[PDB]
Design a protein around this motif. Structure first.
Motif, PDB file in Angstrom:
ATOM      1  N   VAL A 154      19.588  -1.876   3.945  1.00 56.22           N
ATOM      2  CA  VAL A 154      18.651  -2.356   4.953  1.00 56.22           C
ATOM      3  C   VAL A 154      18.676  -3.875   4.960  1.00 56.22           C
ATOM      4  CG1 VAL A 154      17.165  -0.329   4.903  1.00 56.22           C
ATOM      5  CG2 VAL A 154      16.653  -2.239   3.406  1.00 56.22           C
ATOM      6  N   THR A 155      18.521  -4.451   6.141  1.00 52.26           N
ATOM      7  CA  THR A 155      18.291  -5.875   6.294  1.00 52.26           C
ATOM      8  C   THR A 155      17.121  -6.083   7.242  1.00 52.26           C
ATOM      9  OG1 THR A 155      19.316  -8.000   6.936  1.00 52.26           O
ATOM     10  CG2 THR A 155      20.003  -6.050   8.154  1.00 52.26           C
ATOM     11  N   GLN A 156      16.313  -7.091   6.954  1.00 55.27           N
ATOM     12  CA  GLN A 156      15.192  -7.438   7.809  1.00 55.27           C
ATOM     13  C   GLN A 156      15.450  -8.704   8.614  1.00 55.27           C
ATOM     14  OE1 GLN A 156      11.260  -6.087   6.423  1.00 55.27           O
ATOM     15  NE2 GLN A 156      12.095  -5.987   4.366  1.00 55.27           N
ATOM     16  N   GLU A 157      16.603  -9.351   8.425  1.00 56.02           N
ATOM     17  CA  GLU A 157      17.021 -10.522   9.198  1.00 56.02           C
ATOM     18  C   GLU A 157      18.507 -10.421   9.549  1.00 56.02           C
ATOM     19  OE1 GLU A 157      16.134 -14.256   7.327  1.00 56.02           O
ATOM     20  OE2 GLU A 157      14.040 -13.747   6.925  1.00 56.02           O
ATOM     21  N   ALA A 158      18.872  -9.416  10.344  1.00 54.81           N
ATOM     22  CA  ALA A 158      20.174  -9.383  11.000  1.00 54.81           C
ATOM     23  C   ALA A 158      20.201 -10.277  12.240  1.00 54.81           C
ATOM     24  CB  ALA A 158      20.543  -7.955  11.385  1.00 54.81           C
ATOM     25  N   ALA A 159      21.409 -10.613  12.677  1.00 51.16           N
ATOM     26  CA  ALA A 159      21.652 -11.202  13.993  1.00 51.16           C
ATOM     27  C   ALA A 159      22.558 -10.285  14.819  1.00 51.16           C
ATOM     28  CB  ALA A 159      22.252 -12.599  13.842  1.00 51.16           C
ATOM     29  N   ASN A 160      22.027  -9.144  15.247  1.00 54.81           N
ATOM     30  CA  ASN A 160      22.792  -8.053  15.879  1.00 54.81           C
ATOM     31  C   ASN A 160      23.907  -7.650  14.904  1.00 54.81           C
ATOM     32  OD1 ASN A 160      24.476  -6.556  17.940  1.00 54.81           O
ATOM     33  ND2 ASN A 160      22.850  -7.258  19.289  1.00 54.81           N
ATOM     34  N   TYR A 161      25.011  -7.074  15.373  1.00 57.28           N
ATOM     35  CA  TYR A 161      26.234  -7.054  14.574  1.00 57.28           C
ATOM     36  C   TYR A 161      27.474  -6.999  15.459  1.00 57.28           C
ATOM     37  CZ  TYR A 161      26.273  -1.859  14.784  1.00 57.28           C
ATOM     38  OH  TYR A 161      26.257  -0.553  15.177  1.00 57.28           O
ATOM     39  N   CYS A 162      28.596  -7.410  14.878  1.00 61.27           N
ATOM     40  CA  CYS A 162      29.884  -7.470  15.558  1.00 61.27           C
ATOM     41  C   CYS A 162      30.682  -6.180  15.379  1.00 61.27           C
ATOM     42  CB  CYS A 162      30.676  -8.668  15.027  1.00 61.27           C
ATOM     43  SG  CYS A 162      32.327  -8.881  15.686  1.00 61.27           S
ATOM     44  N   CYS A 163      31.157  -5.617  16.486  1.00 62.84           N
ATOM     45  CA  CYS A 163      32.256  -4.652  16.484  1.00 62.84           C
ATOM     46  C   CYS A 163      33.517  -5.388  16.919  1.00 62.84           C
ATOM     47  CB  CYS A 163      31.976  -3.469  17.409  1.00 62.84           C
ATOM     48  SG  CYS A 163      30.582  -2.446  16.948  1.00 62.84           S
ATOM     49  N   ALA A 164      34.483  -5.506  16.014  1.00 60.00           N
ATOM     50  CA  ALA A 164      35.691  -6.281  16.275  1.00 60.00           C
ATOM     51  C   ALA A 164      36.434  -5.788  17.512  1.00 60.00           C
ATOM     52  CB  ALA A 164      36.605  -6.240  15.054  1.00 60.00           C
TER      53      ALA A 164
END
Ligand SMILES: CC(C)Oc1ccc(C(=O)Nc2cccc3c(-c4ccc(CN)s4)ccnc23)cc1
Lengths: 247, 38, 289, 238, 247, 38, 247, 38
Positions: free
Chosen positions: D15-25
């Motif tokens: 779990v993360t509470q401070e993501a910045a969305n995520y990348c799909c290459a």
């Protein structure tokens, strides 16, 4: 007239070009065609025919003796009998085979191989062998319980004389190369090894030593690509009487 | 492109994909089975 | 989403905004997405119907022009006393020797293309007699085929190798080689080793091996020597390209690797790619009247 | 929405509470090899949850003088868990990867990490004609350090490295980065011991700084192989 | 036969010609196509990806330090922080960028640019900046109330880290040229300037100095024309081991 | 004009105007909005 | 292949040939067309525009003074005022005119001319002139009652400032030639002469001397044929800075 | 005959017989009459 310009490659002689050319003998009628047995239309039909491997390519094996492997009764369990180098480009048991010779006119290859072994001991001789193919990456296995981890067939001698080991096409790329660097990742196929699964057991009146003949062919998933001059033949001089054709 | 009057003048015929490898691989009078062969 | 783009996009007129909760000029670079702010959102715009084509930046057009890949000069003479290219040379085919083509190709990770090859030959008399209209033979020797040892070796009989014979008075010789990788694309970069042992070459995919080009003069030597220069040009065509890369900045050192040194000082130094200005407040080419 | 994330693969979850969305290459998702692209004819093993799970590497300390860090895939995982065992016993491998990079600090810290996944990161050596050797490239689980991150150690450009799949950890904004990598090769499968498809690079483009009392600020890397397939069973190279 | 005549340009080798040519390897079957991630079909897709500007191209900025601009708390209002030269042809912060490097293979360009700035101070740091684009004609503005008359964005630091300044295509001609005469009316774009709108304000436990990273990309109204050899690469000698390919 | 028997012999194919720049500009799993992105 | 043979003229460079040729810049997109005022599509549109004749081509007429003819009050009736040579090929009042300059790029001509004269005396000046065209065959007429037998217009000065004399196409052949032999029957057009029909009459406060400006144009029945290098321009040396283009 | 892919490669276009000489001969806002012009 038609305005025209010449491109690069105008006037070149390319030995693989494909054009019509002027008939030197006009109205010549060629001899009628006649049915002849054994027409070949693709060279892949030839490489599908099994032919003997020169597995006993050792000094003191002369001529025909190189085409067979002699097996004897052992007193230690699970001993190694022989290994087969799988290099078609480098000299080895596979080179002088129908699949081998035709393939060496090409640079790229793909597809499965079959090795067939015929046991030629007496009827009273019995035994079981394990024949293993090891995919590439490490050294050739020297023990049965290492070789057993690869692709293998356990062969019991019986009324049917012969067993096939398939070498399946297991490769990252679509093709391998007939590369003189045998250790290249684009070329190395791995190894075939034969071990005793049990023992060769014969009665006193049979010969104590028996022979295998190994054969190889391609399967029909096999393909060859990029034609080249085969390194199997060459000349340093004119042949005898080649000069006399000018005399 | 072939404007010559003799048909043997034409370019090569690379279109014959018919094979019958069994005439070299299986010339046995009774065909093999997929089953003890002898 | 994939779409057919033939011209640059139109601009639409835009009004004054002043909307709470809507901030199209703010972005979050940390996501890894590029800014989606449109001009219509940043300023008031007019309508512009845009007719500028984009065809000259098609990857086919960007790469499919002929570039020098090989250049070899050799003596055409009686060589019995030479120690040298004795009326022929062998070249191991590569794209890494001339930097203009190399840098363009290295903008991509994978390329699939056929190679249009043009062979240009020129001759000079050695230190005048006129220039001979020589016949040359180029022969392609694939992997594992035997290369010629001599100008007159029987390898040149070319039973199954492709050869082209061409005159110096001809237009440049031209042939196409197909895409011939054992993979679906060439590896322009290869983070790997060529063999199953540890000593194999780093950085060259064995799958992309083309072979050797062998070129001889077919004529016997004349009583006087000449220098013959052969130039090989390659044009990629029928191109597919994958995974664009940051361009090369430092000078190339070697055809064998990506090794780097930089220029001694900026531009394109290892410490400084862009040339310096006196300060971040200095405008170097400032207009003054 | 975009700020909180849970990733669950096998027996592992993050779990993360401070993501910045995520990348799909390149907008791809990992998949198994379909029959119309397959080459090797033996039936593959697909271990699923035994391999397709997060493995956590050793953490690295972020320091004022850090040049950045790199790990090569599959090399960094080739000795870890059941992924490593299947690698050692099989000639051929294929997978995607899920990369999750972790770094937290206080609200008084500043710093920015570029987290970039580079396909075919063929390294150069500095100031020599000799190519990098085997031990320069094959760092395994420990990874390597950048010599000249400004040119990505390959005569090229950190500034243009945003052309690759990437995120940033800007300590003000977020404390983790996530990149999903598909299979990325010219062949449908490969020998995992001699070629690396992907390099994870973590580069501190803005250095770590604060005026609070200093603490160790670690960077931690968790990688899940995805859709692992193995072909060509034999003895272990190991 | 057909009557014909040769035109001017017969037999020329034009490096941008577009003809079919003789296949050297007849009946060769290329490897089947396979789906690979990340196919590029137009180079304009690459220039739309934002990449870091080398704004701190000053002596004593080494390596990575050149890719960031450091901002400090000031005691005078509305001070200038930095300016960005907009010359892509002459060496400057824009050259080594994805839009920059690809554009330098071309001679003519049109369309809007975006500059994005990411604030990388601590969470407790606050501030407002004004980023101005000045269309060409005069000198670069040195005061905020001069720069404020151009196109600008006022940026407040907050939860969203980054702001875009659009540089709109404002030009008399359809295209500009990548001209070494930067002061030419066919080439000069004008200036980008950054001023304090308020101040950088930080508490004692945050670092007193903070950094901006600037990025640039093209918008999708962008177009490139007339391909040329890029001046970014050259060689004076043969490369190492280029000779060994003949040996 | 192409009279050769192999299709790879043909002239260049300059007609592929398909683009998808979002695979490099927007590889985020949740698409951007035109609206606070975080 | 196609059997072919080369014709005479194969490989020639004819400067007026008309073929397609290889595009050096593939896929280049030219700048969109924009509407511009004043498109010309046929050069005959230019020769229809009237332009000043240099009738006062005399020593002691300098510059602008050569473009006007001064008329004074006479004390003898029906006096000759001026004549106009009609040779466009030989140097004369018609050469440096729009019809003249364009026509000298051609060898053959046909069709009518208009001469227009504008009276530029004061409003209080009065007078009548007779303007005569004499078809060729004899000498230019020196008396009014000889010139009056040809084609003529009697012009009264008034509110309308200007009169036209048409020179109608009166020729045996379809075309005339711009021939340096002005007396050739294929070239000579004849003469224009101006006489007093009455007198120039002015009051004391008007200027005693008044000017005519003569103009010529082609009519739309006019045609030009067989393009040639115009003898109006030439160079003996390279121009200044033409060498510097190589430096 | 034009086998090049770019249309600017073509031979010259000598077929445009449209004229409007009045834009040079009669640029007066009120047209002339065939009648005192002033
Ligand atoms: C003798 C004649 C009949 O045939 C030939 C055959 C070949 C040549 C010749 O130089 N080709 C070539 C020169 C330079 C490069 C290549 C390539 C490459 C594609 C990707 C690469 C990265 N590794 S390299 C492929 C095929 N060719 C090439 C010239 C003539």
């Amino acid at each position: 007239g038609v305005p025209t310009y010449l491109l690069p490659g105008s006037g070149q002689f390319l030995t693989t070009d494909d054009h019509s050319s002027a008939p030197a003998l006009p109205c010549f009628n060629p001899t009628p065609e006649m049915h002849i047995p054994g027409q070949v239309r693709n060279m892949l039909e030839v490489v599908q025919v099994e032919s003997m491997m020169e597995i006993n390519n050792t000094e003191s094996a002369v001529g025909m003796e190189r085409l067979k492997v002699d097996i004897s009764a052992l007193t230690d369990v699970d001993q190694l009998l022989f290994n087969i180098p799988l290099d078609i480009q480098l000299d080895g048991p596979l080179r002088n085979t129908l699949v081998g010779n035709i393939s060496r006119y090409y640079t790229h290859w793909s597809g499965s191989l079959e090795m067939t072994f015929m046991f030629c001991g007496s009827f009273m001789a019995a035994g079981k062998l394990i024949l293993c193919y090891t995919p590439p990456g490490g050294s050739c296995p020297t023990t049965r319980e290492t070789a057993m981890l690869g692709t293998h067939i356990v062969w019991d001698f019986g009324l049917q004389s012969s067993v096939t080991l398939i070498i399946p096409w297991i490769s990252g790329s679509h093709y391998r190369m007939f590369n003189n660097d045998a250790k290249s990742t684009n070329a190395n196929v791995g190894y075939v090894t034969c071990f005793m699964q049990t023992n060769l057991i014969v009665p006193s009146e049979s010969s104590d030593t028996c022979s295998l003949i190994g054969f190889i062919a391609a399967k029909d998933d096999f393909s060859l690509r990029l034609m080249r001059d085969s390194p199997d033949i060459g000349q340093l001089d004119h042949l005898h009487a080649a000069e006399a054709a000018y005399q | 492109i072939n404007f010559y009057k003799d048909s043997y003048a034409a370019s090569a015929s690379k279109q014959d994909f018919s094979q019958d490898p069994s005439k070299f691989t299986e010339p046995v009078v009774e065909g093999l089975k997929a089953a003890p062969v002898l | 989403i994939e779409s057919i783009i033939k011209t640059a996009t139109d601009t639409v007129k835009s009004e004054i905004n002043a909307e709470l909760g809507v901030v199209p000029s703010l972005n979050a670079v940390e996501t890894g997405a590029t800014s989606n702010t449109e001009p219509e959102e940043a300023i008031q715009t007019r309508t512009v119907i845009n007719q500028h084509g984009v065809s000259e930046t098609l990857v086919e057009n960007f790469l499919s022009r002929a570039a020098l890949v090989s250049k070899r000069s050799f003596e055409y003479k009686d060589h019995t006393s030479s120690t040298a290219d004795k009326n022929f040379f062998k070249w191991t085919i590569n794209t890494r020797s001339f930097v203009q083509l190399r840098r363009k190709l290295e903008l991509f990770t994978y390329l699939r293309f056929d190679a249009e090859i043009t062979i240009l030959t020129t001759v000079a008399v050695n230190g005048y007699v006129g220039l001979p209209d020589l016949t040359l033979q180029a022969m392609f020797v694939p992997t594992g085929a035997l290369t010629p040892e001599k100008q007159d070796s029987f390898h040149w009989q070319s039973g199954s190798n492709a050869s082209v014979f061409f005159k110096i008075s001809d237009p440049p010789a031209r042939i196409t080689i197909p895409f011939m990788c054992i993979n679906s694309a060439y590896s322009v970069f290869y983070d790997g080793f060529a063999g199953f042992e540890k000593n194999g070459l780093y950085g060259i995919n064995p799958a992309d091996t083309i072979g050797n080009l062998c070129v001889r003069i077919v004529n016997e030597h004349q009583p006087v020597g000449f220098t013959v220069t052969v130039r090989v040009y390659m044009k990629p065509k029928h191109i597919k390209a994958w995974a664009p890369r940051p361009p090369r900045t430092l000078p190339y050192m070697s055809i064998a690797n990506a090794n780097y040194k930089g220029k001694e000082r900026a531009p394109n130094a290892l410490s400084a790619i862009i040339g310096n200005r006196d300060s971040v407040k200095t405008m170097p080419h400032n207009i003054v009247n | 929405s975009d700020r909180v994330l849970q990733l669950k693969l096998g027996n592992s979850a993050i779990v993360t509470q401070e993501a910045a969305n995520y990348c799909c290459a390149y907008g791809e998702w990992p998949n198994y090899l379909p029959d119309h692209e397959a080459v090797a004819i033996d039936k593959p093993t697909q271990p699923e949850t035994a391999t397709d799970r997060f493995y956590t590497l050793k953490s690295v300390k972020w320091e004022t003088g850090s040049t950045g860090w790199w790990w090569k895939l599959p090399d960094a995982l080739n000795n870890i868990g059941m992924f490593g065992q299947n690698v050692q016993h099989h000639y051929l491998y294929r997978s995607g990867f899920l990369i999750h990079v972790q770094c937290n600090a206080t609200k008084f810290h500043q710093g920015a990490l570029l987290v970039v996944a580079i396909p075919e990161h063929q390294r150069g050596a500095h100031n020599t004609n000799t190519s990098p050797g085997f031990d320069d490239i094959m760092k395994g689980e420990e990874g390597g350090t950048f010599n000249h991150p400004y040119v990505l150690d390959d005569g090229t450009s950190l500034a243009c490295a945003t052309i690759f799949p990437h995120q940033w950890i800007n300590l003000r904004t977020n404390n983790s980065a996530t990149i999903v990598l598909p299979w990325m090769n010219a062949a449908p499968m490969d020998f995992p011991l001699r070629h690396n498809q992907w390099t994870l690079a973590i580069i501190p483009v803005v250095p770590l700084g604060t005026r609070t009392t200093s603490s160790m600020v670690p960077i931690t890397v968790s990688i899940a192989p995805m859709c692992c397939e193995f072909n060509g069973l034999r003895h272990a190279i190991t």
